[PDB]
Design a protein around this ligand. Structure first.
Ligand code: CDL
Ligand code: CDL
Ligand code: CDL
Ligand code: PLX
Ligand code: PLX
Ligand code: PEE
Ligand code: PEE
Ligand code: PEE
Ligand code: 8Q1
Lengths: 52, 175, 606, 459, 56, 88
């Protein structure tokens, strides 16, 4: 039980919290949206020819 | 405290009214506060300062890990397993970071609601507005992926959404 | 750091120390109950300090101290809410528990497992504090189920008695029915609002929909024993009298009202749920009071009284006065606990007799018990300037000055009259007249534990209403303008009930005997609700669980379709295949048929 | 991963080279040490699995299952050494060999990278189990039970094999990493419908799903104590683990093929929970509670959401521990009165006070008292089901009410009331039985403080 | 006297060494999957002036 | 504490007290071993009332099958002693 309690953070939870804090700070100062609707950039996406 | 960044966890400047007694009766809260400070807080600070002197004698650091940016799933070929693997790992890390961003915004919202008292409905408009936008973006990005999610399914969802947006924009231009 | 958070946390933390000593060499000593009682008294004294801080500056706080786990965007952490409700209810519960433990040191003196009894009482108090101070719904559910399990273990304390076990399982059943609504509210709030914590729920629900509030109302009806799920509270008197005084009268049974009070910002916005709550409270407060006036066991009368007061609290919630309902909770605790203590004193002094028909003239035989019970009944009846008066009389006016269901208003007034009626019944049949108990008199109330424990609650029953009412900030708009006949209505109907009940009780001295009315049978047998609802649904469910679920489906048809059909078919095919007599004349002719078929069926089309 | 497998394999020659009176001590000590070594697999990553080699890998779903599997062997050895006292030395060693082989097969089953190897080990687990049931069971029904256990499973898994070698012929591989990355949607066709059924029914029979759950009340009841412990705690979870693993290839076909199974699970939950109310056999009541609990895992896996998968993992682990404890608790009374009738021995709280406390705690965890992980898994599945459809709350709510009813009933019948007068051979509890109960219950409570260790790869 | 202990307690070292051997067999396995050691786009790194491999 | 350790003499005293308070039976004639029918000329209905009076005196209920047989004060005393586990 002691060994399991002190297992190192290989799940990267504190790391994710730190990264999230960094981006929230950066985006707020910039005035950019806190979160982006599209994860992948539109420029690198090639949609089919036309809507019909 | 210097533990956390005050720009990412803000709070108002904490206006506290000065004590303005009107009666001549003794204040029991003041007597109890003096007793608490003399009997509880002082030994606690003494023990803490001893612990801090012991800590200062040994100093070591741990480093936040920095990860390089790798190509995403859009640049990967159909059956190139190694680029797919790296893109998927990066996508999973970005998903975790986005979860924690939503967590930070939710903590701001909760703290505002508790702090503002009976005027929370008006004094927490900014926090509610920030949470609404972040929630909408997170829902657009990861909602309905289900168990067995991946970067490929997220890309397909985004492509479907862009096709819907393009059709809706073409419909409006014909009016 | 200001001492508010530290003191509020330490108050609850020190209550757990005697539980950690349950394996020490104090738990096998006869000083353990006194140790537990002393710990609870010290906890009460410590909890008095944050209450002073709140009365001074209105200080409130939430403490999220331990992060338990994080699921995606949802974070669940151990958080305590230390608002007005928490810091006001904690000292009242600790005061009542201190009195009841001192009382139990005397009432349960000859029990071989009194140490276990004290730890069990302590365990319940811990779970109730967890319920009351919870800031998220998961911690609230932890306390919610903890108090139910402790109630199960304390109702069936005498586990060799079949009726006590039946009552304990009845309590569990009736509370699981409302646990359904609790879980429905949790699921709705998690999906729709993405949080279990109170602050987020308040932000994201400006106009709350029906379904979560209906779930909360079902949970409250289950916990507080309202009309649909009422019968478990009267049956919970199978437990020892201190258990009735602590759990089922003043502290545990108010958890549903407390739940609806904690969610009053959302209930302010839904009119349908307020109407449902008001109607449920009204029918409860009338039905239980109507049942009370013809009961003969004294504990049953007090149990129906507390069920009717819970109905009144629910009515107060239904007219959008949550702070008035909380105030009535705090007031009712004092005199209801002390009434149960006086009943226990009578029962012990009469060799474990609980029927009022065998209690005669105790007015002069137990003078202190008489004084305490008279003062408690006067406090319960809304006598002016007593503890009961500073809440109940304000409730009756509030219903009179509101856009209210007319039937609910009429039911509340009639129930107010019946309260005085059954208080009269208790006093008349227990303390007036001539002795009706056995001739070997054992009456003795000169134990300092009993006297001190009752006196401490007696002082509260007199002064707590005025002390508390004048120190809480105004949390509503008062009703400064009333018609005179509407200001005095509570007293008028209480006095009318007093006079009518006293006259009908004096009628019993006459030398006439007549058979009872059908209305009396309806009242005395509890509307026949237990006689019907504990026999028809249980019988049908338990009959279907065997006739069809076990026998028809599991033992017969599920066997018949998959394994028995397969075994029968394979057995038949095996018998057909293997029953050849061994005559070569038969199967060489078979060979000829086979050869001919092969030449034409597979050979004539290649 | 061989650092767990090879020590487990060394338990066989160690058992066979031990003294006649030292086999239990050696086996218990070294299986406990193997559990200690297995605890290292709980250190999991947040993004991908622990890929030890081309053959074996560990994930956040299989690591708690492995830990429970290794932890169960010492408890089985402790529970078995009482009723096997009069047995000969070689047959005792054969029984311990059966248990060791079962553990070895399960450990490799939970970590196999390729689905055919997983299938071979998941089917190999049948032989030791059947031998245990049909050689060391106590009654004449144990033979029939064995047949029911053997043919229900195989009739389900024989199509699965045919599906698996079919899939490898079209996608090229059965490696789970490749299967997950190169995943493609399932079209809506009759061939795909039957491929979906062949990939699912094998796991459904193992759960088991209401309707094909008949083998379980026979096999668990007639088995010896270690047989029923391993059948309830680990062997039922093979179906859940396999369904969770194989669901990736199934989409989007699962959205409409899951309806009959969701209906069967959501109604059979009520059916089996109500069956528990009228059950004269205590061990049979405990067995039926398992079907009622696994219906919920089936629902959670079919609806395919992160909250449902987390809940299903937590519930599988919690049910393993609780059902094993309940079977042991019933066996303690059976070894006294030699009958499984629930009303034969009553009022036992008077005669066995601490075993009554064990009974109470086991019953409390069975009805998912908060904050136990039983409740965590149940509530997560209920929330996900509510998202899937609000009306589910009615069925889910009803099941909770019934589960508490037959649990406490089981408690009131055996512990409360008055002890039967004729029985006079009720000896005080042994230290072995008390420790066996404690080693079941303490890890369960300890898992409340760190629930992320049992919430699977979706946490 | 050493035989009076060893000859009836040597079965007590089968599982320990079986553990040790197991660990060894893992390490050798790691030596067959080094085709991308210090070659991934995420962890590619210039070697320290003395180190030879980024991991064993 | 609770009720004192009631003894055999106390049971006999209370039984005879209750009997002597019955108008039908005179005090001088009544004896511990007196039969309620042969000695006192009492009917079956009368006997039932004595049993009920004993129940009211000692605060416990005697079953009808057990109650009918009791025809002497000594029998009642022995029954009560057997129920309350009185050995002196
Ligand atoms: C101020 C402004 C307003 C002024 C209002 C006007 C002034 C007051 C008006 C009169 C109020 C009532 C006063 C007397 C109450 C009755 C007491 C009595 O003597 O009972 C006699 C008799 C029972 O006596 P018993 O059986 O001979 O008793 C044997 C021994 O005494 C057994 O002895 P025991 O030891 O068992 O004792 C029995 C017990 C009592 O025995 C009983 O159990 C019966 C008592 C019932 C009383 C019920 C009163 C309230 C009922 C509300 C019900 C709501 C509607 C429900 C309708 C359900 C329909 C299904 O005795 C008591 O403990 C005391 C009784 C209570 C006395 C005080 C009552 C105060 C509250 C009522 C007055 C409220 C005044 C304030 C109003 C202000 C409003 C603004 O019951 C009745 O006959 C009348 C009961 C009242 C309702 C009856 C209605 C008829 C029912 C059927 C109707 C037809 C239905 C057709 C089908 C429809 C289907 C849709
Ligand atoms: C789709 C195309 C068409 C469908 C084809 C598939 C259907 C095949 C049907 C097979 C039926 C035979 C077994 C079932 C009943 C048992 C026989 C019996 O006697 O009981 C009769 C039973 C009542 O009789 P019973 O007197 O009460 O019997 C009392 C005892 O229980 C029974 O008395 P017992 O125990 O004393 O039995 C006497 C004896 C008698 O055993 C037999 O009856 C032998 C029957 C097997 C011949 C297979 C015929 C199938 C031909 C398909 C070709 C398609 C052409 C177009 O039993 C044996 O000794 C058998 C032991 C094993 C020896 C195996 C020797 C046969 C060779 C294997 C098959 C031969 C394949 C051909 C060449 C192969 C060379 C490479 O019910 C009947 O009367 C029904 C008779 C025939 C019904 C067939 C239904 C077919 C309907 C066609 C629908 C077409 C829809 C349109 C399509 C578009
Ligand atoms: C809130 C409490 C604060 C606790 C402070 C720390 C205490 C740590 C204890 C941990 C549990 C120990 C393991 C259980 C087996 C005990 C072994 C034993 O046989 O002892 C005999 C030993 C010697 O007695 P004996 O005279 O030989 O007994 C003869 C007969 O057996 C006669 O025996 P008996 O009639 O005395 O029976 C034993 C006794 C006690 O035995 C037990 O029931 C132990 C199991 C408790 C129920 C667990 C199953 C239900 C599902 C919930 C699981 C929650 C797990 C939490 C994490 C646990 C981590 C270890 O039975 C009961 O008192 C009623 C049990 C029902 C409890 C109802 C309340 C449930 C919810 C409570 C809140 C849980 C979360 C707290 C935090 C919330 C936010 C602040 O007795 C003791 O030493 C006392 C037993 C311990 C009672 C603790 C009750 C509260 C436990 C709460 C969970 C742990 C929380 C710790 C963190 C702070 C909170
Ligand atoms: C008999 C008398 C009874 C009463 C008297 C007893 C006296 C009191 C003793 C009870 C203590 C009460 C517990 C109070 C909680 C404090 C403990 C808590 O702090 O520890 C937790 C830690 O608990 C562990 O995480 C959980 C232990 C894991 C359990 C594994 C069981 C061992 C294996 C057995 C095999 C079973 C199979 C299981 C299958 C999966 C916190 O987790 P975490 O928030 O991180 O810690 C933060 C700091 N860290 C991260 C740096 C460490
Ligand atoms: C007791 C425990 C047993 C285990 C339970 C297992 C349950 C298995 C059930 C399988 C789920 C669905 C199977 C196939 C999907 C639809 C079936 C049919 O009813 O629906 C219609 C199917 O159409 C017709 O109804 C054909 C089916 C009729 C003939 C089949 C007989 C079914 C009767 C029930 C048998 C009992 C099943 C269990 C046997 C033991 C759909 O309309 P249609 O648009 O046209 O077809 C679209 C499907 N496409 C895309 C593949 C083309
Ligand atoms: C015993 C006496 C000890 C005397 C010396 C100790 C004095 C102070 C010690 C300070 C230790 C440092 C410390 O605790 O820091 C916080 C440290 C780590 O931070 P986390 O919040 O866990 O991070 C997230 C991981 N989940 O937390 C801890 O380890 C202490 C936690 C104890 C909490 C108090 C007890 C409550 C838990 C009871 C169990 C309840 C079950 C689950 C409840 C669910 C509630 C929603
Ligand atoms: C077309 C061919 C169909 C082939 C499918 C085979 C199905 C697999 C089950 C085969 C088992 C056959 C057993 C049998 O029939 O024996 C009958 C037997 C006669 O007794 P004896 O065994 O000879 O010994 C005692 C009497 N002196 O009766 C019994 O006792 C039966 C006991 C065993 C029954 C267990 C069967 C469980 C099957 C459950 C359903 C699955 C069946 C397999 C197909 C499933 C559907 C695809
Ligand atoms: C304990 C009882 C459990 C019972 C489990 C049995 C049900 C298993 C499900 C069916 C098993 C056979 C499926 C075959 C494996 C699928 C592989 C596949 O995809 O092949 C299909 C072919 O699918 C089939 O042929 C299957 C048809 C059925 C054959 C055997 C009939 C078995 C009975 C069917 C109904 C029973 C299934 C549900 C019963 C549930 C249990 C009661 C398409 O391949 P192609 O031919 O190449 O098509 C593309 C190019 N033309
Ligand atoms: C609240 C209460 C409800 C009201 C209850 C209604 C009950 C009815 C009231 C009237 C009672 C009857 O009819 S009275 C029953 C009618 N029939 C007879 O009485 C038959 C003759 N009885 C004998 O001969 C016996 O000797 C015997 C008399 C028993 C004496 O026996 P001892 O002397 O040898 O003990």
């Amino acid at each position: 039980s002691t060994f399991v309690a002190y297992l190192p953070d290989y799940r990267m939870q504190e790391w994710a919290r730190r990264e999230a804090e960094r981006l929230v700070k950066y985006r707020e100062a910039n005035g950019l949206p806190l979160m982006e609707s599209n994860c992948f950039d539109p420029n690198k996406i090639q949609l089919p020819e036309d809507e019909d | 405290p210097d533990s956390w960044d005050k720009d990412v966890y803000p709070e108002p400047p904490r206006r506290t009214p000065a004590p303005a007694p009107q009666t001549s009766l003794p204040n029991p809260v003041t007597y109890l506060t003096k007793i608490f400070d003399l009997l509880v807080d002082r030994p606690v600070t003494l023990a803490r300062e001893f612990i801090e002197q012991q800590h200062a004698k040994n100093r070591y650091y741990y480093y936040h890990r920095e990860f390089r940016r790798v190509p995403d799933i859009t640049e990967c070929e159909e059956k190139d397993i190694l680029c797919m693997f790296e893109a998927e790992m990066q996508w999973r890390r970005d998903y975790k970071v986005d979860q924690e961003i939503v967590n930070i915004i939710q903590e701001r919202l909760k703290a505002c609601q508790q702090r503002e008292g009976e005027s929370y409905r008006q004094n927490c408009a900014k926090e509610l507005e920030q949470f609404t936008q972040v929630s909408k973006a997170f829902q657009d990005r990861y909602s309905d992926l289900g168990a067995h999610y991946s970067a490929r399914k997220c890309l397909a969802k985004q492509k479907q959404r862009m096709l819907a947006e393009r059709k809706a924009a073409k419909e409006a231009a014909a009016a | 750091m200001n001492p508010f958070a530290s003191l509020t946390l330490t108050t609850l933390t020190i209550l757990t120390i005697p539980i950690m000593m349950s394996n020490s060499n104090i738990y096998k000593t006869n000083l353990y109950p006194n140790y537990v009682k002393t710990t609870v008294s010290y906890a009460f004294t410590l909890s008095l300090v944050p209450l002073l801080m709140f009365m001074h500056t209105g200080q409130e706080m939430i403490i999220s101290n331990w992060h338990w786990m994080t699921l995606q965007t949802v974070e669940l952490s151990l958080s305590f809410k230390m608002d007005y409700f928490s810091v006001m209810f904690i000292p009242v519960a600790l005061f009542v528990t201190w009195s009841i433990m001192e009382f139990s040191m005397w009432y349960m003196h000859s029990d071989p497992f009194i140490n276990r009894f004290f730890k069990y009482l302590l365990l319940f108090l811990i779970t109730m504090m967890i319920l009351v101070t919870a800031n998220n719904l998961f911690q609230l559910f932890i306390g919610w189920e903890g108090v139910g399990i402790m109630s199960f273990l304390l109702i069936g304390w005498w586990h060799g008695r079949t009726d006590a076990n039946t009552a304990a399982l009845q309590a569990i059943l009736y509370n699981r029915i409302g646990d359904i609504g609790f879980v429905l509210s949790m699921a709705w709030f998690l999906t729709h609002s993405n949080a279990w914590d109170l602050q987020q729920i308040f932000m994201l629900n400006n106009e709350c929909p029906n379904m979560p509030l209906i779930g909360l109302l079902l949970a409250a009806a289950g916990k507080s024993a309202q009309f649909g799920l009422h019968p478990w509270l009267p049956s919970a008197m199978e437990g020892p009298t201190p258990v009735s005084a602590l759990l089922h009268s003043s502290t545990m049974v108010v958890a549903g009202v407390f739940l609806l009070i904690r969610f009053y910002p959302l209930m302010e916005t839904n009119k349908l749920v307020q109407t449902m709550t008001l109607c449920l409270g009204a029918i409860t407060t009338l039905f239980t009071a109507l049942c009370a006036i013809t009961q003969n066991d004294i504990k049953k009368i007090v149990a129906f009284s507390t069920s009717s007061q819970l109905g009144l609290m629910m009515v107060t919630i239904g007219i959008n006065q949550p702070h008035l309902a909380f105030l009535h909770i705090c007031m009712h605790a004092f005199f209801k606990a002390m009434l149960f203590m006086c009943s226990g004193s009578i029962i012990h002094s009469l060799n474990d007799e609980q029927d009022i028909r065998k209690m005669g003239g105790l007015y002069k035989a137990m003078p202190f018990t008489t004084t305490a019970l008279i003062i408690g009944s006067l406090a319960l009846t809304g006598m002016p300037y007593l503890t009961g008066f500073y809440s109940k009389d304000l409730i009756i006016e509030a219903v009179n000055m509101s856009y209210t269901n007319a039937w609910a208003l009429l039911m509340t007034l009639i129930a107010t009259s019946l309260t005085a009626a059954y208080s009269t019944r208790i006093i008349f049949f227990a303390f007036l007249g001539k002795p009706r108990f056995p001739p070997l008199v054992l009456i003795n109330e000169n134990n300092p534990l009993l006297i001190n424990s009752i006196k401490r609650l007696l002082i509260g029953s007199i002064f707590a209403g005025f002390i508390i009412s004048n120190n809480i900030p105004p949390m509503t708009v008062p009703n400064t303008t009333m018609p005179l006949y509407m200001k005095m209505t509570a007293l008028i109907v209480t006095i009318m009930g007093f006079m009518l009940a006293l006259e009908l009780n004096n009628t019993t001295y006459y030398l006439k005997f007549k058979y009872p009315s059908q209305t009396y049978k309806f009242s005395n047998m509890l509307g026949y609700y237990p006689s019907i609802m504990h026999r028809l649904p249980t019988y049908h469910n338990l009959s279907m669980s065997q006739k069809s679920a076990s026998s028809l489906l599991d033992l017969i048809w599920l066997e018949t379709i998959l394994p028995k059909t397969t075994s029968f078919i394979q057995m038949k095919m095996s018998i057909m295949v293997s029953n050849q007599k061994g005559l070569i004349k038969l199967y060489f002719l078979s060979f000829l048929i086979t050869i001919m078929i092969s030449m034409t069926l597979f050979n004539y089309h290649e | 991963m061989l650092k767990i497998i090879i020590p487990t394999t060394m338990l066989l020659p160690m058992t066979w080279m031990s003294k006649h009176n030292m086999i239990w001590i050696n086996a218990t000590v070294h299986s406990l040490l193997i559990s200690l070594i297995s605890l290292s697999l709980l250190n999991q990553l947040g993004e991908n699995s622990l890929n030890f080699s081309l053959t074996f890998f560990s994930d956040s779903l299989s690591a708690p299952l492995l830990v429970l599997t290794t932890w169960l062997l010492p408890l089985m050895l402790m529970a078995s050494q009482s009723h096997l006292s009069k047995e000969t030395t070689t047959r005792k060693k054969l029984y311990i060999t059966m248990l060791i082989l079962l553990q070895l097969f399960l450990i490799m089953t939970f970590t196999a990278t390729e689905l055919i190897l997983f299938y071979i080990l998941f089917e190999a687990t049948l032989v030791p189990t059947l031998i245990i049931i049909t050689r060391w069971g106590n009654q004449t029904e144990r033979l029939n039970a064995g047949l029911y256990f053997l043919f229900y499973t195989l009739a389900g898994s024989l199509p699965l094999l045919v599906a698996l070698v079919y899939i490898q012929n079209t996608t090229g591989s059965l490696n789970f990493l490749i299967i997950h990355y190169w995943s493609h949607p399932l079209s809506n066709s009759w061939s795909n419908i039957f491929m979906w059924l062949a990939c699912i029914m094998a796991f459904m029979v193992k759960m088991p799903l209401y309707g094909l759950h008949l083998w379980l009340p026979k096999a668990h009841v007639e088995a010896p104590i270690a047989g029923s412990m391993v059948l309830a705690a680990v062997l039922l979870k093979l179906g859940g683990y396999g369904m969770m693993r194989i669901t990736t290839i199934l989409n989007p076909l699962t959205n409409y093929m899951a309806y009959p199974f969701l209906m069967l699970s959501m109604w059979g939950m009520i059916m089996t929970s109500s069956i528990c109310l009228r059950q004269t056999d205590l061990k049979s009541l405990i067995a039926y509670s398992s079907v009622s609990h696994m219906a919920l895992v089936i629902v959670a896996i079919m609806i395919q959401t992160p909250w449902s998968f987390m809940g299903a993992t937590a519930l599988m682990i919690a049910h393993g521990l609780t059902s094993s404890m309940l079977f042991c608790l019933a066996n303690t009374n059976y070894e006294r009165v030699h009958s499984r009738t629930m009303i034969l021995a009553r009022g036992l709280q008077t005669l066995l006070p601490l075993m009554a406390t064990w009974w109470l705690v086991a019953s409390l965890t069975n009805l998912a008292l908060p904050p136990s992980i039983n409740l965590i898994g149940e509530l997560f599945i209920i929330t996900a089901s509510f998202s899937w459809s609000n009306i589910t709350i009615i069925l889910m709510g009803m099941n909770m009410m019934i589960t508490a009813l037959y649990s406490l009933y089981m408690l009131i019948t055996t512990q409360r009331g008055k002890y039967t007068h004729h029985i006079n051979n009720i000896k005080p509890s042994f230290t072995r039985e008390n420790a066996l109960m404690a080693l079941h219950i303490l890890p369960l409570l300890l898992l409340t403080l760190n629930p992320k260790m049992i919430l699977g790869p979706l946490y | 006297n050493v035989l009076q202990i060893v000859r009836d307690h040597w079965v007590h070292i089968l599982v320990p060494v079986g553990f040790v051997f197991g660990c060894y067999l893992d390490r050798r396995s790691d030596e067959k999957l080094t085709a991308f050691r210090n070659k991934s786009l995420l962890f590619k790194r210039e070697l320290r002036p003395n180190e030879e491999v980024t991991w064993k | 504490s609770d009720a004192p350790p009631l003894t055999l003499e106390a049971i006999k005293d209370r039984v005879l007290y209750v009997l002597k308070l019955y108008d039908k039976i005179d005090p001088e004639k009544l004896s511990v071993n007196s039969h309620f029918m042969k000695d006192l000329g009492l009917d079956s209905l009368d006997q039932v009332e004595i049993i009920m009076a004993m129940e009211d005196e000692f605060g416990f209920e005697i079953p009808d099958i057990d109650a009918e047989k009791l025809m002497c004060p000594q029998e009642i005393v022995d029954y009560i002693a057997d129920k309350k586990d009185v050995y002196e």
